[PDB]
Design a protein around this ligand. Structure first.
Ligand SMILES: NC(=O)c1ccc[n+]([C@@H]2O[C@H](COP(=O)([O-])OP(=O)(O)OC[C@H]3O[C@@H](n4cnc5c(N)ncnc54)[C@H](OP(=O)(O)O)[C@@H]3O)[C@@H](O)[C@H]2O)c1
Ligand SMILES: NC(=O)c1ccc[n+]([C@@H]2O[C@H](COP(=O)([O-])OP(=O)(O)OC[C@H]3O[C@@H](n4cnc5c(N)ncnc54)[C@H](OP(=O)(O)O)[C@@H]3O)[C@@H](O)[C@H]2O)c1
Ligand SMILES: NC(=O)c1ccc[n+]([C@@H]2O[C@H](COP(=O)([O-])OP(=O)(O)OC[C@H]3O[C@@H](n4cnc5c(N)ncnc54)[C@H](OP(=O)(O)O)[C@@H]3O)[C@@H](O)[C@H]2O)c1
Ligand SMILES: NC(=O)c1ccc[n+]([C@@H]2O[C@H](COP(=O)([O-])OP(=O)(O)OC[C@H]3O[C@@H](n4cnc5c(N)ncnc54)[C@H](OP(=O)(O)O)[C@@H]3O)[C@@H](O)[C@H]2O)c1
Lengths: 234, 235, 236, 234
């Protein structure tokens, strides 16, 4: 795919879907910044892999649920590269229980760490992308955020709020060509029963949806939610 | 409308949409419980207005965002009336501001107040209504939670999260006939009215009647739905 | 429920969900006009049952897919009645098959009969309700129109078209206080399927009928262009 | 973007959005079949321009609303190329008028011509793509099929029916790996006012959204309605 931008920051990218987004975007020629919070071994391993395939990769440590930490990280990337073309808000956790077994503590943890991180990222994207009249931001949402689930009142709250907040951000960034969109993965690798495509999704399929929404090919799409769930939910 | 249930708790019912919801359900024979946080001047005045007109009304206290406070009023109401049929999560604030001028303080205040509160309400509705195999909960969301708005990242996050959480709760309470539903009002009382097909602002009372429908027996097969009351502003 | 308006025409009302809308609206004091197409007997039995129960009811024969018949029937009701306050486009057919087995014949029949009929209904409603600045029209759609279904390309086409056309009609009727809304029933009783319904049961026809009543009644005076899901959680 | 398949038919592709879709899919390596009904001038001009630019391109004459005539066209393509990997139902007309002024003739014309044609395309796609267990179909709908518009009861009916029928076809084709998806463009080159991106859309951005949905990058996406409207509707 074709990118006018040059670099991308991916929160929570040391493993899983975030790692695969990093891998996909770096194989398409963007310099990927791979966020991690705790142990650096796995992030450093991914960065080494990506350079060793010939790509551009750097690692950066911050807590995406911390305002100061994540503002200073974006400032450091601006100072190293000259700007920031792309952001992927992927940082997220799960703490599933039935609601009657869930303290407001278990709710606040998931809400803060899944929504406020995305809010910080989107606001800082608005700041650093405005001067150049160019940017794209993708919020990794979920199918749970669109339909809800048993035992996932907190998670579904966070990712439905992410879907609606992202549209608000699209409204605010659209006049300076700063686009915001959500991706709602389905089941990514019994549950396979209800999937019409009769298989789990690969992380790469998510990653290439993200790549499309960051790319120039989606330059008229903003404020949209892209389902990547094999037909589980239309 | 027809109600098998007997009483309702309405958070933030002292004025505006909450109070006129309260008037509405009282007029249809339900015992209303106005909930307030600060002054009891308007809440008491409402309560009295509702009892002169011949209706059953009382008041109760908590910060609907406070877990303990919320819970403990719900036991108080169960002990007074023998149960709680209906709940309306109406409590909510706005703190509008462009996102770049918005401290995460201003974001947490709105999230914690507007959606954690609805979480305590819904989770406790599940608890008190499960025994009796009957219940109906309506969460008062907004068109902003469906479409988003400039200057309302915090409010749209809270209300959209409510709308989705409501669906999860509907899942958890469906097997026991506890129904969960949301209402998304539009602009409720000139350039604003240009984009409303009905060409007018909504009365707080139209929102209240939609809430009554979702609480009544007439919606007994409707759970997990989001009912748009916006005069056509959003379809 | 409260109704400012006085009478209602329900298309396809001689049996099933339409008969239950007629029964429910009759019991709320509306004069119901029960439409039928072919054999009257079942329709006149419904009219007699409603009149015995103390309610107002009449029958009227016309083909909802025929522009002239449906025009002329609405004109007749306006002249018996003084006007027409409420309309329920309930007429619909199914011809389920897989698409590779479906002729275009089998597609137009369901389209011409499920959508065009609603189009005529809503357009005549606009006409006859404009002067009095009051009116409410409900279009009986389906969950299939929202979600799509195997073997139901034609039916889902017709009901999704109905759902979107109903919103356009809301736009055109909104200035004369003529509201347009849709109901999307799920699986209604007439047990593999009850699996995927959270409420763990089929719906009753009366639950649909009461949702229709709400969308006709005064209580929904600010709700227009909406699609009200009656499916017990099968689709959110 | 990559494509496992080799060719694509596009109905109503002689000018406008369909021409741009032909132009875009041609530059990415697909052999494009340019459908037209009436004059062949403009379609030959398109063909000659794409063959000038080094690409494979062929015109084909048929009325998309006629069952026999678009079944036969698909059959002739199958015989020439050996198969058909991709289809784009783009044929479409408007006859805008207030509902009280609109004969059922006016309604039937737009219905028969916008929605029946897509039905004939999607069934025939089911038939010809099933054996190879590979295919992708994109139905070009509209924002009007999602929110409605005054004066456009007929167009909105056709396009919203297209959007729901496409999910039904997605269900039917899922097991064979034949994907169905819709595109809902907004305003495509006062009005601009209500568009957050503050400009009309290029046919070119619609065409690239279509390309993504046909491509291998959307291989876990079926039954989706991808909005291309610059924030005009979220
Ligand atoms: N897999 C699915 O089916 C599915 C579908 C829907 C969406 N997604 C989304 O996919 C994303 C991650 O994919 P995954 O399921 O493969 O999860 P995963 O394997 O847990 O990867 C999540 C990553 O995000 C990190 N993270 C969490 N909070 C963070 C913070 N505040 N700052 C920085 N990094 C943070 C992780 O925590 P640690 O430091 O603890 O490793 C981890 O590296 C999330 O947004 C999830 O909500 C998942
Ligand atoms: N009006 C609209 O256009 C619109 C549309 C969408 C939905 N709604 C919803 O309508 C509801 C209220 O209607 P309104 O707009 O008319 O607002 P309002 O006039 O401000 O009434 C809101 C009430 O909720 C109370 N409240 C706030 N937080 C509370 C808490 N934690 N515990 C208990 N009570 C609390 C208020 O606070 P005080 O103690 O500070 O008075 C006040 O009595 C909200 O949920 C809002 O989100 C508004
Ligand atoms: N049952 C469900 O699960 C379900 C769910 C979604 C919505 N609905 C909708 O419910 C409505 C009817 O309910 P039902 O399922 O109980 O169907 P039903 O039992 O078949 O009742 C349908 C009625 O509509 C009549 N009708 C058909 N075309 C007509 C026309 N052109 N003019 C006048 N009447 C016409 C019937 O035809 P005859 O003269 O041939 O009897 C019959 O009386 C339809 O709109 C259907 O599309 C059904
Ligand atoms: N432009 C927009 O703002 C917008 C937005 C939403 C979607 N779209 C969709 O985009 C498509 C067309 O793009 P456009 O707006 O640029 O329209 P256009 O300029 O009119 O191009 C439409 C083409 O489709 C052809 N066509 C119509 N019916 C046909 C049939 N039965 N068989 C074969 N070809 C047929 C045309 O007819 P002739 O032979 O009469 O030339 C013409 O070549 C349609 O599906 C329209 O509904 C338009």
């Amino acid at each position: 795919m074709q990118f006018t931008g040059k670099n991308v920051l991916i929160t929570g990218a040391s493993k899983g879907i975030g790692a695969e987004i990093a891998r996909t975007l770096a194989s398409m020629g963007l310099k990927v910044w791979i966020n991690y919070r705790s142990n650096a071994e796995v992030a450093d391993a991914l960065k080494n892999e990506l350079e060793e395939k010939g790509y551009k990769a750097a690692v950066i440590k911050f807590d995406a649920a911390s305002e100061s930490d994540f503002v200073e990280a974006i400032q450091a990337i601006v100072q190293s590269d000259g700007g920031l073309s792309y952001l992927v808000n992927n940082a997220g956790v799960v703490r599933d229980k039935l609601a009657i077994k869930m303290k407001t503590e278990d709710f606040h943890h998931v809400i803060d760490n899944n929504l406020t991180s995305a809010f910080i990222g989107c606001r800082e994207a608005l700041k650093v992308m405005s001067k150049s009249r160019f940017g794209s931001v993708v919020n990794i949402a979920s199918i749970i955020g669109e339909r809800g689930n048993m035992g996932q009142t907190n998670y579904s709250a966070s990712k439905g709020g992410m879907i609606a907040m992202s549209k608000s951000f699209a409204y605010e960034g659209a006049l300076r060509n700063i686009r915001f969109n959500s991706v709602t993965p389905g089941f990514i690798e019994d549950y396979v029963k209800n999937i019409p495509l009769n298989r789990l999704g690969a992380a790469k399929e998510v990653a290439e949806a993200v790549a499309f929404l960051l790319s120039d090919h989606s330059s008229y799409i903003t404020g949209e939610t892209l389902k990547v769930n094999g037909g589980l939910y239309m």
